């Protein structure tokens, strides 16, 4: 949701074209009273309570809560036997057929989320294999997220990614309350 | 708009077995968008309903309403097509099983009134439908006699049960 920005908008009776004059006098016509042909009652009139402008749904959970959610996702995968640790993502070949066959043989899910430490260093073989696949998605460690972890049946991690996630998620435990945004220098924070 | 009446003539029945009563022929005909009120056409349709083709033509030839001529033309066309295409042996051996008038697609016009006011005229159009069935017209339903009427009363008496008990 927080990314969501709904671009639905409707014209109110003030924004509908025309509709300035009174359609007919108050009294004597024998018809209903009206003040403009663009009120919500009229066909082609305004929308009383419609979507208004581009609306944002942005809100931030506490970073502690988000880190805890990442931890809970990892624990759920491990407990349900969907987490698979790897020494490295290096493949014998870049053929997507090899990767799909390997997943099927090892009884992985229809969908696999492979995670590597950093984007730049991801092996060329796995990059080629996963670029052509739709249910096998390769992401960097910095991109791990609960939504994708839940969308993908199995979660494949490397040892460096495991260490990275452990450090990043545990720091939230035992960190002080911030003095200023952590992007700024700190005595011990990289 | 619907045009099922025209299609009703295109139904083909399977061949009848030799030991089967001869199926009377049925011919559906209609005229669309007649400049005539369906209400006025209904009276002519009711008049000719249930009669033989010749009797219907005779009545229509001497009725004064405008729709009489249109219905006569439709009936004559129905007779011609029944003989030519539907294998009806005798022209006269046809009777009007169904005859009704349907609302057509009407046009809206303005009628000007006295004080800048107006009404919405309707250039009324109507359809006309006929089914012609081969064979002599079915005999008119005879009025129920006193004997049958008393028979019905006695049947009502006999049907009585002891209501609301074992």
């Amino acid at each position: 949701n927080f990314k969501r920005i709904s671009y639905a908008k409707t014209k109110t009776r003030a924004e509908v074209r025309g509709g300035g004059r009174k359609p007919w006098p108050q009294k004597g016509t024998g018809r209903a009273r009206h003040g403009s042909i663009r009120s919500p009652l009229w066909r082609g009139g305004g929308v009383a309570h419609g979507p208004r402008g581009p609306t944002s749904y942005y809100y931030m959970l506490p970073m502690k809560v988000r880190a805890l959610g990442l931890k809970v996702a990892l624990t759920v995968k491990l407990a349900q036997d969907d987490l698979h640790i790897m020494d490295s993502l290096e493949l014998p070949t870049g053929d997507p057929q090899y990767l799909t066959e390997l997943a099927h043989y090892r009884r992985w899910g229809d969908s696999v989320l492979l995670v590597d430490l950093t984007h730049e260093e991801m092996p060329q073989s796995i990059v080629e294999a996963t670029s052509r696949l739709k249910t096998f998605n390769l992401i960097p460690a910095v991109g791990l997220n609960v939504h994708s972890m839940l969308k993908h049946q199995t979660l494949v991690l490397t040892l460096p990614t495991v260490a990275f996630l452990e450090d990043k998620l545990l720091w939230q435990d035992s960190r002080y309350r911030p003095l200023y945004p952590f992007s700024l220098p700190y005595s011990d924070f990289p | 708009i619907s045009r099922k009446w025209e299609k009703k003539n295109k139904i083909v029945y399977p061949p009848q077995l030799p030991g089967e009563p001869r199926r009377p022929a049925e011919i559906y005909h209609c005229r669309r968008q007649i400049k005539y009120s369906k209400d006025k056409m209904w009276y002519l349709a009711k008049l000719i309903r249930g009669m033989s083709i010749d009797q219907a033509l005779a009545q229509l030839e001497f009725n004064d309403k405008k729709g009489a001529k249109i219905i006569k033309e439709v009936l004559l066309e129905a007779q011609d097509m029944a003989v030519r295409d539907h294998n009806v042996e005798f022209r006269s051996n046809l009777y009007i099983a169904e005859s009704t008038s349907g609302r057509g697609q009407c046009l809206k016009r303005i009628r000007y009134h006295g004080r800048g006011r107006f009404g919405i005229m309707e250039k009324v159009y109507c359809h006309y439908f006929v089914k012609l069935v081969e064979g002599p017209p079915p005999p008119p339903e005879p009025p129920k006699t006193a004997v049958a009427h008393a028979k019905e009363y006695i049947q009502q008496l006999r049907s009585r049960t002891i209501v609301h008990t074992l």
Binding site: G28 | Q105, I110, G116, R117
Partner: peptide, 19 residues
């Protein structure tokens, strides 16, 4: 005071439409 409500004329297209 005299009260007069002017007659209202409907748009002409509605009547003039044809098949």
């Amino acid at each position: 005071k005299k009260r007069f409500t002017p007659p209202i004329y409907q748009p002409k297209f509605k009547t003039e439409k044809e098949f």
